[PDB]
Amino acid sequence: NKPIKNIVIVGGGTAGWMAASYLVRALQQQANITLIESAAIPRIGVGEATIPSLQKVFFDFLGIPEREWMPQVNGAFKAAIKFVNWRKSPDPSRDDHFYHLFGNVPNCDGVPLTHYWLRKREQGFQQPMEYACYPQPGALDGKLAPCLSDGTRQMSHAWHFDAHLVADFLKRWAVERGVNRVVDEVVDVRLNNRGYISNLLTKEGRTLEADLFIDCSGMRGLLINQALKEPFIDMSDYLLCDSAVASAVPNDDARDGVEPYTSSIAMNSGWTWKIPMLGRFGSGYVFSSHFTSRDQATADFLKLWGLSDNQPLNQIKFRVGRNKRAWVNNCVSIGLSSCFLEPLDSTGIYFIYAALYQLVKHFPDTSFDPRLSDAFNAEIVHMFDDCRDFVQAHYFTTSRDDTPFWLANRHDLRLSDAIKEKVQRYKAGLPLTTTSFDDSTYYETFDYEFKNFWLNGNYYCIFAGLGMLPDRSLPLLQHRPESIEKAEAMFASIRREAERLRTSLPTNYDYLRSLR
Amino acid sequence: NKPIKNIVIVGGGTAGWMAASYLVRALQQQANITLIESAAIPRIGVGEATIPSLQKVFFDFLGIPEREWMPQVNGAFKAAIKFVNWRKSPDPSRDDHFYHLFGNVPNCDGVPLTHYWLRKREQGFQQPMEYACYPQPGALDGKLAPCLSDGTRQMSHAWHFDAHLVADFLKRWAVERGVNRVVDEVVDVRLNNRGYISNLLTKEGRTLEADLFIDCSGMRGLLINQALKEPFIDMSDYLLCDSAVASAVPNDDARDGVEPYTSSIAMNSGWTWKIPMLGRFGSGYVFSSHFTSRDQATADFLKLWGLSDNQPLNQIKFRVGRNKRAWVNNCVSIGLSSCFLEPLDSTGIYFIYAALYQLVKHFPDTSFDPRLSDAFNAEIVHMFDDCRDFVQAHYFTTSRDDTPFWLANRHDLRLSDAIKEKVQRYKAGLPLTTTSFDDSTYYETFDYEFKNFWLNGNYYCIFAGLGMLPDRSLPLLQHRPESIEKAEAMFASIRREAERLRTSLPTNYDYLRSLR
Numbered sequence A, B: 001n002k003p004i005k006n007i008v009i010v011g012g013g014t015a016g017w018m019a020a021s022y023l024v025r026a027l028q029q030q031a032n033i034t035l036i037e038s039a040a041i042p043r044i045g046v047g048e049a050t051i052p053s054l055q056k057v058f059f060d061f062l063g064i065p066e067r068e069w070m071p072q073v074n075g076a077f078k079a080a081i082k083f084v085n086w087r088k089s090p091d092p093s094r095d096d097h098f099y100h101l102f103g104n105v106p107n108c109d110g111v112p113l114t115h116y117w118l119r120k121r122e123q124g125f126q127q128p129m130e131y132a133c134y135p136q137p138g139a140l141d142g143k144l145a146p147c148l149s150d151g152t153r154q155m156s157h158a159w160h161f162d163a164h165l166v167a168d169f170l171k172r173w174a175v176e177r178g179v180n181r182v183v184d185e186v187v188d189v190r191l192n193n194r195g196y197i198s199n200l201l202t203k204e205g206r207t208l209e210a211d212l213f214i215d216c217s218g219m220r221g222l223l224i225n226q227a228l229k230e231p232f233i234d235m236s237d238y239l240l241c242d243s244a245v246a247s248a249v250p251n252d253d254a255r256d257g258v259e260p261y262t263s264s265i266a267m268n269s270g271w272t273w274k275i276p277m278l279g280r281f282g283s284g285y286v287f288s289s290h291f292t293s294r295d296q297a298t299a300d301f302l303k304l305w306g307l308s309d310n311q312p313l314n315q316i317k318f319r320v321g322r323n324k325r326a327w328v329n330n331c332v333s334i335g336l337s338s339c340f341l342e343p344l345d346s347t348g349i350y351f352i353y354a355a356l357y358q359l360v361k362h363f364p365d366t367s368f369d370p371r372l373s374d375a376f377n378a379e380i381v382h383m384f385d386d387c388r389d390f391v392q393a394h395y396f397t398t399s400r401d402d403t404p405f406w407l408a409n410r411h412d413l414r415l416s417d418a419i420k421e422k423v424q425r426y427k428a429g430l431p432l433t434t435t436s437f438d439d440s441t442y443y444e445t446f447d448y449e450f451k452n453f454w455l456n457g458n459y460y461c462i463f464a465g466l467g468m469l470p471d472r473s474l475p476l477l478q479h480r481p482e483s484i485e486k487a488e489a490m491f492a493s494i495r496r497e498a499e500r501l502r503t504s505l506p507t508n509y510d511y512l513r514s515l516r
């Protein structure tokens, strides 16, 4: 069979230029690649927080180190997501916060530290789980960098960046390596009688043909949904939010510092993101229109940050779910045309490069063997649905009952069999999936991370954070007193490292300025 | 809740003494353990070939290195299973053999070598897959040891040993660390009204009580099947054999050497194992009674080895399948009381220590939380059924059509959805699950190996061995000429290592004698 020669990508958002870059790199330029993007249709404007596989799976693949891309996109550091006012009905006299951290919780004689922490917690021990089991949370409270001043990394971290700058950076990289950029707008899609895309008609009269079409057209799904008619599985029975009101907000970095993490601040009818970088943070109130109007959500958002009635806003609506199939006939959807999940977990951009990695693993010839797309499709379903379930677990575990929105989350959601089973095992005292690798190995073995994406420590962070603990510590530990004492030694080490980091890390602000 | 204090194990076979040892070790002797075994009921008499996790998961756990246990059980080395006369209707003018090897096939730029081999095979390249992709197969032909003379390991390997000696060795180890050995026979089992085992009545009038009962009673499943009435899922719709005729056969080691592997020699109505060790090999014709009588199978077995009409034999029958649930109420089945699969894959003893590892991971208190047993049960189902499918794939992939037995295997088996899907992906040219770890790391990370037990290289060995190849090499490789050339370099390295091993390894015979 003839190989794939001609590739057309529709869409010039983050997905489009990620796809163009990744395929320029993977197909050894043995490919004619054309990207078409409409001047009249703006990018979504958001997507600024990431996870550590962005470097390993995406940028390393292109041969671009952090030090090269970061300065060009207003890059900053992310060590965690901090959840504020999620656990209980909010009380301004109380500090309700917890971290969801990158990296893995150590094991002690085959048992995670989370489990030794719980046994202590049964006996009255008061310190929060993540402050016991990880050395960096206090450093994040102190707004400290993830590295020493000389660049040496001291904790696992990912990135914050400007959405527009990242796409433009990738545009320049791909165009310079022979991607053909067309500024025009696809107006019609022509299918043959067998249902494969034959060509695209544009607004300015071009007819585009290709062997492979990549749909990066955003939520409209021009090729995958509109032309090929693939069902979208709406999942508003699983998750309630459907809208966001978004803006960039100036920050007094010299007075206030730069938080080395994303915040998730729970609201009356959804939650607000905060994404610090030098000079400014991106922020957005993710909300449900069934519980609050866009007008009210806009008022709540402005009030939170003390913004003015004159401040222009990025008003977004969205549908939660994914296509029944990501790849149909000669068309692979990537990005918002494929699926969507609110950014509680910062996995939107992860879905782009994870799908691109998987497309290359299942790469077709011009005969489009359906066994390759079937196998690809099944990897996407598992990837999405597991993340969907992990996001939903924040919502059904909360104890908030102060509004109709939080009540509905407590009582009215549809839960998968898979999530119920995981919750069941947790409540019994069982660790969920654990790794014996260190952070570096885990963040370097994508076929492992891909299938083992959510680990014991991820679930513990969220569940213990929201104040839902197992019925019982692990029965085995009543037979293992020496292991319990060895775990105390490990808790003492973590505490020493926490103290060292306190007096050794530069502030995130100063470090960022030093980079530039 | 009160912890598990008293443990009774029924059964003094390999399972019983593995269980007793493993629990003596895991529960820090904070446990009263009693094993009961009947003098009138013999052990099964077989189970002599193993896989590399025997050392890592089992013996290392007990703190017993190879050099300690091997000499006491007539230990020998196993580097592979060699399949003879499996591929085609047998012709004594033809050499029909292939190896299924331990360890992992290297990757080249994210693609397994198996896939670069196939692309060469499309262009007419004649060398067999495993001789291209692994450095040891020729060494195994030459009956060479897996180590240099000074002990340095040169290939991944496992063990052969005497079944009776291993159990007796473990008996001495467990008894010396405070296991109470009772020679008596359980005649009745008493259940309360809620259905939990209350006590055992013995032939000599003892009443045994415990918090936890381990059923190692062999195929009868005295506690799990006979008392608790748990269904056995018979799987004779998946796999046809139901019997074996077995013996030990003297070997002229000085004239003939000692094969560093297990052989699987396909017969008219099943297949024969060969398990070499110093002085002798264990052998057994696994057969289906629907296709041949035990009398005929006995004649075929004797004829194969030139044995005498006076040679006494271990005549076995068995049922293929597993319990619906391995752990019910206060009783965990381990060994032949749990499940059975013919030794095509040498996983019977693997099932013992894998279940023991999983029991300790899900260890109960005296309240027997059903969520712990449910989660344990589900790990056992996945473990067994995946192995069942892997075994069945040898049978439905063969081209033999010379007997009713081989025809039935070609046409008449029930296949799981899971195996069909794997076969589908294979035929498309896709690698099945791959690892980026080396052999050592993989054989040291049990939570990884447990879930990722059968890898691309395992399936390739069997499928390519039987002469079923994919429709097509991987389309991606037509875009990657530099990777193809880099893979040629890797093929050249393997070939150099093969030559080095040829002139460097001692024979298996000599090495074994040198150990003693």
Ligand SMILES: Cc1cc2nc3c(=O)[nH]c(=O)nc-3n(C[C@H](O)[C@H](O)[C@H](O)COP(=O)(O)OP(=O)(O)OC[C@H]3O[C@@H](n4cnc5c(N)ncnc54)[C@H](O)[C@@H]3O)c2cc1C
Residues within 6 Å of the ligand: A010, A011, A012, A013, A014, A015, A016, A036, A037, A038, A039, A040, A041, A042, A043, A044, A045, A046, A047, A048, A049, A050, A184, A185, A186, A187, A216, A217, A218, A219, A220, A222, A244, A284, A316, A318, A334, A335, A336, A337, A343, A346, A347, A348, A349, A350, A352
């Ligand atoms: C509210 C919200 C918050 C989010 N937060 C995060 C986050 O914190 N972290 C994270 O990783 N991700 C986040 N995401 C996801 C992230 O924004 C996206 O994954 C990413 O920006 C990719 O967008 P896209 O290219 O698929 O779509 P878009 O940005 O919508 O781009 C669509 C492109 O297709 C073009 N196009 C459409 N139709 C045509 C046509 N007819 N002819 C020619 N061109 C056409 C458009 O002009 C545009 O160029 C968030 C998403 C939303 C909605």
Ligand SMILES: Cc1cc2nc3c(=O)[nH]c(=O)nc-3n(C[C@H](O)[C@H](O)[C@H](O)COP(=O)(O)OP(=O)(O)OC[C@H]3O[C@@H](n4cnc5c(N)ncnc54)[C@H](O)[C@@H]3O)c2cc1C
Residues within 6 Å of the ligand: B010, B011, B012, B013, B014, B015, B016, B036, B037, B038, B039, B040, B041, B042, B043, B044, B045, B046, B047, B048, B049, B050, B184, B185, B186, B187, B216, B217, B218, B219, B220, B222, B244, B284, B316, B318, B334, B335, B336, B337, B343, B346, B347, B348, B349, B350, B352
């Ligand atoms: C034909 C065949 C080939 C095999 N080949 C391999 C192989 O190559 N590699 C491999 O790893 N595995 C192999 N196996 C599996 C292996 O033999 C077993 O996994 C292992 O030996 C464990 O046996 P067991 O203890 O469960 O049962 P058994 O050996 O049957 O022991 C049963 C024990 O329970 C006792 N008992 C029963 N009832 C009572 C009672 N009423 N009161 C007191 N005591 C009682 C018996 O006396 C005996 O001590 C093979 C199995 C078979 C059948």
Ligand SMILES: N[C@@H](Cc1c[nH]c2ccccc12)C(=O)O
Residues within 6 Å of the ligand: A051, A052, A053, A080, A081, A100, A101, A102, A103, A345, A346, A347, A449, A452, A453, A454, A458
């Ligand atoms: N495997 C992911 C898990 C993850 C996804 N989103 C997260 C947000 C916060 C912490 C961890 C995550 C990682 O560590 O990158």
Ligand SMILES: N[C@@H](Cc1c[nH]c2ccccc12)C(=O)O
Residues within 6 Å of the ligand: B051, B052, B053, B080, B081, B100, B101, B102, B103, B345, B346, B347, B449, B452, B453, B454, B458
């Ligand atoms: N993960 C197993 C796979 C396996 C089971 N039985 C085998 C027999 C031969 C070769 C490999 C195997 C191992 O390498 O140990």
Ligand SMILES: [Cl-]
Residues within 6 Å of the ligand: A341, A342, A343, A344, A345, A346, A347, A348, A349
């Ligand atoms: Cl996101």
Ligand SMILES: [Cl-]
Residues within 6 Å of the ligand: A103, A104, A105, A434, A435, A455, A456, A457, A458
């Ligand atoms: Cl973890």
Ligand SMILES: [Cl-]
Residues within 6 Å of the ligand: B341, B342, B343, B344, B345, B346, B347, B348, B349
């Ligand atoms: Cl076996």
Ligand SMILES: [Cl-]
Residues within 6 Å of the ligand: B103, B104, B105, B434, B435, B455, B456, B457, B458
């Ligand atoms: Cl492999």
